[PDB]
Amino acid sequence: AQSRGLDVAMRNANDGISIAQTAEGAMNESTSILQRMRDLALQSANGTNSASER
Amino acid sequence: QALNEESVALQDELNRIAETTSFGGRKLLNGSFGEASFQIGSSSGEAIIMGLTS
C-alpha cells in the first residue's frame, strides 16, 4: 500500500513539476516583454522626439 | 543706403536661419526648444538638461 501511495505521490509531484515549468515559461515571456517595454520607455524620454515619434 | 539694404538682406537671412534649422521637424533656434531632458543613464533619473535659446 505504501508503494502504491508512493507511485501516486510521484505522479502528482511530476504533474506539479510540469505545471511549474509551463508557468515559468509564460513568466519568462512576460519578463522579456517587460524588458522591451522598459527599453521603449527609456527611448521615449529622449528630448529629440517632438510629438509624432512619441 | 546700399549698405543698409545689404544689411537688411543679411538680417532677413538671420531670421530665416533662426526659423528654419530643424532636426527632422523639431525647430532648434526658433525658441520653442527651450529646455529638454536627455535620458543618458540606465534606469530613471540619470538624465541631463539641454537648453537652447532663440
Side-chain angles (χ1 to χ4, degrees):
Chain A
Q2 200 174 97
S3 307
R4 300 299 219 288
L6 287 191
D7 158 30
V8 170
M10 274 208 316
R11 174 52 31 61
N12 294 319
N14 264 344
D15 205 82
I17 283 191
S18 155
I19 273 161
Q21 220 157 342
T22 306
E24 163 69 354
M27 219 79 87
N28 156 259
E29 186 66 7
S30 179
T31 179
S32 168
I33 289 305
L34 273 206
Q35 289 173 6
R36 178 85 212 170
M37 191 162 6
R38 192 168 171 287
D39 289 16
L40 264 298
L42 269 171
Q43 196 153 9
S44 174
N46 179 354
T48 191
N49 298 53
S50 59
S52 54
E53 49 265 19
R54 298 267 197 101
Chain B
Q1 181 282 339
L3 308 203
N4 167 51
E5 177 48 55
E6 168 144 28
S7 95
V8 161
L10 268 38
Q11 203 164 210
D12 272 352
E13 191 47 42
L14 252 170
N15 270 230
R16 195 206 58 75
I17 271 177
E19 302 290 10
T20 290
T21 81
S22 44
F23 188 77
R26 183 74 184 290
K27 304 309 190 322
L28 290 96
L29 316 190
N30 177 323
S32 301
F33 204 63
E35 61 186 349
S37 314
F38 278 92
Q39 165 61 279
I40 88 164
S42 78
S43 100
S44 48
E46 300 98 340
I48 67 160
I49 283 296
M50 191 145 278
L52 282 185
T53 62
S54 76

